[model samples]
Target chain A: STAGKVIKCKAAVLWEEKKPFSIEEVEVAPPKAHEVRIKMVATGICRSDDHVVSGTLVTPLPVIAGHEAAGIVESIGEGVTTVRPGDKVIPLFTPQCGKCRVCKHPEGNFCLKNDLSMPRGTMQDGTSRFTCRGKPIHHFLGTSTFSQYTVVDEISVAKIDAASPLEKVCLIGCGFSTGYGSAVKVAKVTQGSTCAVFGLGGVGLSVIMGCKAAGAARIIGVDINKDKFAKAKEVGATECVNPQDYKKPIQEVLTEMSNGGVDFSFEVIGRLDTMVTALSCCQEAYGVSVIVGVPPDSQNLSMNPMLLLSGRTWKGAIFGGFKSKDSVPKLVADFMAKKFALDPLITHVLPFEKINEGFDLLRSGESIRTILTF
Target chain B: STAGKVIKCKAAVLWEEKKPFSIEEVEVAPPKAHEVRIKMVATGICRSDDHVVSGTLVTPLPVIAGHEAAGIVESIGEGVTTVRPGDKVIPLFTPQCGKCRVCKHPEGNFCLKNDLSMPRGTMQDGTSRFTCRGKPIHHFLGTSTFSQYTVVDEISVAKIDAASPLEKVCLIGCGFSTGYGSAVKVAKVTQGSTCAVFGLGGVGLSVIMGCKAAGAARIIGVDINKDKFAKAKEVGATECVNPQDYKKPIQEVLTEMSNGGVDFSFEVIGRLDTMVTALSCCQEAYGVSVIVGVPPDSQNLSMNPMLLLSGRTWKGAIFGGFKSKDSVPKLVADFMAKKFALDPLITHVLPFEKINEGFDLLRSGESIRTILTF
Candidate 1:
């Protein structure tokens, strides 16, 4: 009954189908049952947001964009005991309900429930807390930090120490989970292994970190951008390959680098050619490949049938398949313990209004991860 | 004068390419080291022998056309430690050298040194043992029991008790080995498991017997011939299906009879449609279909990729992947164990002079196995 101050915040709204989200003024309602309201200190633009805006990843129109974020929990609704007000935290793009059967299984990181509802951003109870002109505005990933403030279910937010910069750690919410999970969780990269990661963007860089974390002896990075090579090496890439330098035959370089074929290959670029080349660079008998990028729905990865019969396995990883309840806190703890080189990965920082510029930078391949800091 | 007795015996010899084997007089050859000289007591008229006669199997022509046989060892070659003169024996089409890598490995049954001379039927020393008019005529299998006396590698001969009829157990040498090996050795049917064996020939009936011996609860037999069903049941078939009775839809009947799908299915016919039906009848999560009969080189089996991903497997078996050194003795012992009923399966018995009539009965499906007693 009118005891607290009202919060008006700036956000990006889809507004229409097949169009970029437009900046708008939105009002936030107080958190409801099992929900936490966060005053977003930072957010990162992800390729999935582009797909959502383009409708490639379907969501109802007029939804706000941006999923990866870090902030301070402003308040909590009734029955919310996981996080308290003033707690600095990261919001998971995919929530892990720990009691679900898949969440409890060791091999199952692709927690089932909180995945699909991310794009629509509606709470499990079927309502959104963002409002424009006193009418409900759709949210993009439950933590639609495209706005200055966002409301998320208690399970979606994980408490992190305030010493880490929220602007930089925002990427840990999504891209880091995907790439790192691809190696450590899904592919299970092991000691003395050779690995190849295709593409050197946000997700690809995270995969490199994962492979390094898993003690890969040789990590080869493949990309057409000659500029990314130095940064790739700086972030634990043992070798950098320019696609054009190898007659655009990256598989040959990867094979030559790894002494036969890489023991593990990751396709971080969504193109089909990269997928095939990545798979072929895996060694015989037990090479494993993870497909991390989502290609267009119409395209298929073409491969010979004999490959499957010969003991090579191809798997797809979703949302880094990380269960937020178990992995998110541990990941931050490891990052702090290892003092991992997380700075070089973040290419730029800008305010929320400059998100379209970040997307432009993404399309130009000039940025690895561009965070929108509040 | 030599102490050995010289015997005059008549045989069907293909003297030249594209020529039918004609009744001709041939000299008997005594066994050499690691060999046995067999008196042709009874030999099954296997269609694979027709492939030899028709030149489809591409054996060296001008060859004798019999392999499946039960005989008495008339003489033993030096170092032939397993059998002696007057011992009743069954001749295996394929010999298993226990020392080979495949024989030693649990995953494989391929006998190496034995198959080295298989295609041409010449010994490792590269010479033919069978002769007609002082010119050499090749033996199709190591044991060319089409003649009155044939020499075989000792490893290929299994000694059986003298009380069992030569004609009855001889069918076990080729026909039973092929089908029973498909189930017991390759598929390894489990207790209470549902199974289907395609093509109810003598080999198919043997598969049913092997399934029953393995304690399979439901065994379905499929064949184009209605007459086969009754004989199939007399041995071990729990259910019989005529392809024509399927309303021209074999898969529908397979699904209906199996109550979803079978745990294991065998393709004894090797036709593309039957192979497809067998594969489709494999249950979700852990079904496997075995390809027993060799398909024509021009055709290949087709399947959806998703089926394999869901835990179904399709594979090929060679001679039921039998390691003759180890498995054949156990099979013979199991035969002596009275677990498999092999006596009623013999449909015709003819003298060597009636060999062409035996082939005619085989072609007309009037006989399941026609054994020629010399």
Candidate 2:
């Protein structure tokens, strides 16, 4: 009945930063050419979204913000060949067109179609498919899923396995894969090595879990919050450290604990100071440091290049360097195979109306991940 | 006759920064335990040595300061089995003490015994091997080859083929290997890709040769001097650009030249601005920039992690990430095998007494690699 017609559904529209999400009935237009309409099943709260809400990560106002989502394809427009109606899919916040130079390269994953760097707040055609009370609403990260009904370009959609649980797999759209692939894919962590994780949030714990699967001998998790330690250890961090407990720099403390330094380190904290500290915590001769957390767009990292000249490597990537379109489906399949579990990352789930409470849980650091079901 | 005795020889000593080298007769002591005495045959005037003289690269004063030298082992001390009397050898400024953790790791090359980091300005035994007029003179970088005779640890020496010419192979000790390995080893420049080499001097040209050898389709050499373009082209640079030639930023110029940006870039000039420029000039998704030149230790680079977050890799290494003792000999052998020629790199050969003239040629940008022979 909704094919080629507007679907009026409930959506949480962000009018501006520093204000709570305004839940209202919004019109979700039918999929345009090469676009697909989706009825979002579940969307997870990620810190990057919080950054936008807190005004650290700037974006257009009156936008639908959620991105880590699993949904069912409601309809497809002309030239859309990937996913048909009723197909289980996940919209890629980091899209892979598979035709751009980045998608063509074996090592590259950041696509030219990405909206993160240059926020367009619209589709490739420079138009918004969402409107509230006759006023146009913006899109966020190519996959705005705060609405019960949404439209996304086909290139940004990954058709997942039919048997996948939408609620659980929603974490895969952002946190789990971002951290897991970081340890195994980007760092290429070797067996019997020591690794230090700088933050013990959802992604940090995922990093620990991935490090455990990589057979790392020692996994040390560092966090200012001592409460996260219990959950962090439960997810394979052998030992947890509270940076607040130390008088010296955390890098010095970790260095002392590892009898000089660890082999690999990750800064999931997203602070410029911690990024430098994480890099300094590694064995300088060949240690590798990766920046996983997205820091404030206003802040920049300052360091002596001598930090790298001494045989250390510093790098970062989106979605843990995954080619989103090709990887999300396989990640879902691997989860079905029980290669890894997402249960440790998810702590709470609520109805879409309770979205503000979910973000509150995130701000208070009381919850790892909160999923909202429509 | 001087196997166990001190030999008096003319060595250029830097009494302090902002001062030129003072040629004086100094007493070279016999090799200590695990040390070897070498009679230097040929040494190249490298910009790093120039950095020390200009007071930018801080080191203890009143020290002999040449490292890119090839020599004959005059004698060996107790426990020194790597090199014996009359064996042709090259000094490793960055040593490989095979027992250290850094040396044990497959990717690690900076050994704990290297003098570059915590410069003690003396042998491992905490004593200088040279004395003059009843006063002790400090060593520089383990191999103080400014003297005709010098002492080095067995771990810091690489034995090369007996038929190798010391005059030509000396560049392999530092400049040639440093730049060559930067492309083939550090950045791992792929075939048919585009590369940008920032700086057209010794190591920069070596990077061009390495890029050419790696089969990169385009190698654009950059320098402030227009005069070096001919030599850069001779060494395999497809094109050369001068920073003075454009009013716009060089990175912007390079970005336009490659249509988008280069696949790989090397910062052989060591300026903080150019390091930033070189990193910026690479493809934002998978481009890698290796820092081959040493900048002022005091200055640090400041940039948004978004630069790296966009899929670029920023890294650097010492001696081009080579395991010095294991790599030098093979490079010399490769040179002998006609894998590459050194004639294009060596612009001038001066008697060791005219070392100042060699450095002058470097300062004026009138020479590529000035070889100083004893």
Candidate 3:
């Protein structure tokens, strides 16, 4: 069962930043107290993981770096009662330690135990569970789903329905959940309102789906790349906008198109400038602009406060403001019920050995989502 | 009696930036179509007016500078239906032309006709109603209550209850309403939540008053000046923190003091640096930080997008999100009902002739709100 034993397995390890992920054979350690080990079935390539690979985001070196995946629990350690071996689960980068202040709040989903604020690329006990070439490898976002088998804290694992398809639901672990809940939960996208999504990637497409599901009258898809518009329209984008076609700034173009501006604007592109533009694309009075993208670390958004002062709301959320543990299961159930389709988001399917190729497809913008099966 | 005639009145006019106001006999023109002439009974010297004098904020030269004032409606122009002569009123910089797109939408108070975006410094007809020594002096924020008699657009005048005091209710025109609504209306401050307020002047104290009215559990007043803490505590602040007394950043002090961080933080200091700190003093999840101060024009707030992405709402409001023509009268009524007190805010009073002295008191931080009586 590969329980209570060190099992050598194939995994993708990022030895350093700005380099292609190396497929390495690493020793997967047994789950410690309050931890659960999962045998990865499928994982999705996302921009957030690419941020670490591109060195745009900071994380520890020599780490196993994949966060969005669905797997079956290989084993569970002592005191891990919520999840058990043979259970289908999704590993969370944003853990829900229900005991923390953030998790206790009804509306808040940003758990205090998450890695973003201070990226401690290890488990809660401050130890690495992956060893490669006699050196310990750190866990990326504490999920490390690139590995054939990974260990995550019990709090970071959401047990899902047995009927869930591991290949499709893998996106729900991160990108899908983030985009959907960003509209349904965070922004609370209103019905019959106009919404403009600034990026047409997996997350943005999911956001469009959520917006359409929420009954948005106008789902405007915005992208510099024209190739994305087709899939964007396929997944409920009522209209698409390519900023490159406009002579003036996209904000002005959108304002002109919508007469004022959109009721809701989402910057799903990970650029500081696009974040500013998205905020500007709001109606200045009762408009809501959400930062759905993560720009590089150490960079700041320099903005005139008057933009926010004119009765517009500016906010953002991680994992689409979903409290990972409790919400992911329900999200999987909703997905199973055919509430939203994930077929459009998955553009490529590859084996785990072609992980570097997957990243290349992602970087080239050739693939909306590339799933790697173990 | 002065209706339909050019009334000679004394007003403090700034001929240029960085210059002391010159008190002169200005010609107050009669109200034109859809305009109203207000006989200024009481005006409050505010930092917003001081911004023009400091060259931090820009407006046309030779402008009459005052926005927070209570007055009697002297006369109304042709087609003016909302207000009439002899009515107790407050002049608004944030005019609510009820017919505009903004006024029709709920929760939006930034009127399309506001002078903030493009300072016309004139009446709606694009001409000045103030002239001094053959020079056409511009209007400041459309109110220009520094003058004994000032002409305003009918849409900018909020008629208040007859029993309201002219001196105290003048604060409602800008300071009191801005501070109070920054808490109640804009942020919608939660009950039993921990709150931290930066800058302990009139607006900050008004925020404290609103927080108390909203049933905040711990209202912490943050100020560099220790003297302002007394008034802050008197106005319902549970604790006072002097940032000057601490070696570390105020954000850290408040975070440690509030255990994790306050549920609500108000930046009323008008400093971009303080705005950053106040945002940092909020809980990373579910905390709301409202910008209550008007920072210097053209200055940008450089912030990490992750600060907003962590589930905190970063928002600012003009006139505290109050639709001046509609909300001001209700705010005055609330003040009259003792729902909130204004005495802690008004620290001094002076005759209109001593207007420069009033500015001096405000500039020296020697007064919270100084009322200038005509």
Candidate 4:
């Protein structure tokens, strides 16, 4: 068994910001104590990964990037007991260290240890597990699933049923969990209520699906790109709105359509302006707007305080407010049980060698989600 | 035997914008269907009334300004049954019709019928009840308590325990409810948690009382004037902060003092800047900021949406989320039961003839509350 031995693998590594990834042979170190080695099966190319690559979201360079993935546990380090070799697992960007102050609270998903380690691009001990051509490559989001093999903290891996397909469940690691949990958990989308979702990407469409499953009477999908509207409606949106087609601001148009604004509105686009529009479009006297997207660090959303003062509420959710270790497996189980659809979200699939094309497709707004097979 | 009979009364009426009140004899019409006549006993001089006098909050000229008052019901209309002659009552600016969609919900204080009449400055019939110099003087907030006797919709009157002091319980009409209920009902401030309040005046100090009653461990009162600090501390503020003393923003100073930020915050100063500071100073994830003060109609609150996106919440309360007729009576009972303090807020008392002096005192920030006795 190669349980305690280093393994060689291939990973799409970014050597510089705003540049294409260089697929290179890399050596993966054995998992440290309380960590597990994952044999990557499939990983979903997410918008967040693209943000890091394009320098929209700042991160250390020469890193292996990709956070959404499902794989088999290849080995476990000493003190690791959460999963064993051959167990199907999904890696979490927002790790749930149940002992941390944030993880203990039901309202928090941000583990202090994980958050502290993120900017450092290392494990809890502050060291890299990958080296390419004798140079160290930092981990991305502690998952680094762009590699054929990766090591992550034991607490960051959710053990799932072996029957669940790795390719399908990989989406749950980030995009699906984010958008679906945003509606089901964060907004607690009311039954027979009206909802609006901005940005018809993988996350927004998943929000529509969640709202539909929760029995929403109307799910309005909003996007600047008109081409994305068809898939938006296919995934459970009752109507699609393109802001460019309207003379007034999208919030006013939506408010007029619903006789007021929607009971719940979601911002799945990482633009500060969209965040403001989402909040403004919610009905007063109990309207709730959930922020499901991440804005750039320097960007701030400037809004009229009167919007919230007139009875609407604005709040944000990370990882769809799911406690990764506890909730991700349940989401996987629900996916396997056919509780919702994930097949429609995967717009394209390609080999790892053609991974840059996936990012290109994402940039072109031609894909909801693109999966890469190792 | 004055039921349905017109009566002549003395009222401090606004003859024009930004002008002092003209104390004159006004002919008050008889109570119409669903209306009741209230013999005003004591009315609190509130900043909102001052806003109208200063032309900050636009209203029709020749209007009765006060809304916060306790009185005796002198007569009832044919359809009025909520309150009858001789019953002690408090007037509600935010009336609860009990039949409107908003009144049916626990989260709503805005009644469509009552709100519709506000801009017109009249009763439900779209006509004024008082006339001075043979010209109609419009009602303010549906409860023109500035007058010695005023006719109001039965829905706007909350009958309280006769044992409760009319002068003291009158505070519950607007300022007391707007501030106290903001903490107790709207924010639902957690016990043993920390709180920060902005603007230490009548409403701000009232918020401290509510926060203390709700068992908040740390209550920090913030004001520009250091002189108000002693009064704030007396009314349950654990500490007081004057922004002028700190080079940094008040939010930053308070955030550092609380080891991050308070669990709950309030904006009692109508300025947009204070509203932003109040929101920025709340702890992330579960912190709640409630807007208790009414901003100028032309002014709006502009803030970073990231404040809410990082898990903090922003919401506002009109009349502290009380459903007027239903909740106001309960609040008065709570005050009468000595569940909280109200006397500490009334720093001065004056007869109706000196009503203009009450506004002057308010502008000078010399009085927390000046009760105008009829």
Kept native contacts, fraction for each prediction: 0.00, 0.84, 0.88, 0.53
Query: Using lDDT as the measure, what is the rank order of every candidate, best first?
Result: 2, 3, 4, 1
Model 2 off-target regions past 4 Å?
A: none
What TM-score does each model's chain B reach against the true chain B?
A: 0.90, 0.99, 0.98, 0.97
TM-score-best of 2 and 4 = 2
Sort all candidates by TM-score, best to worst: 2, 3, 4, 1
Q: Give each model a TM-score.
A: 0.59, 0.99, 0.98, 0.92
Measured by DockQ, the strongest candidate is 3
The alpha-carbon lDDT assigned to residue B114 of candidate 3 equals 86
Q: Give the per-residue lDDT digits (tens) of candidate 1, residues A30-101.
A: 888888888889888788777776665666656777788889888888898888888888987667667654
Clashing pairs in 4: A305-B301
lDDT of 3 by residue, B306-347 (tens): 988989888889988888887888888888988778888888
The TM-score of predicted model 1 comes to 0.59
Which candidate order results from sorting by DockQ in descending order? 3, 2, 4, 1
Q: What global local distance difference test value does model 2 have?
A: 0.91
DockQ of candidate 3 is 0.82
Better of 1 and 3 by DockQ: 3
Model 2, C-alpha of B71: deviation from truth (Å): 0.9
Name the lDDT of candidate 4: 0.86
lDDT of each: 0.74, 0.91, 0.90, 0.86
Candidate 3, CAPRI quality class derived from DockQ? high
The alpha-carbon deviation from the true structure for residue A163 of candidate 1, after best TM-score superposition, in angstroms, is 3.1
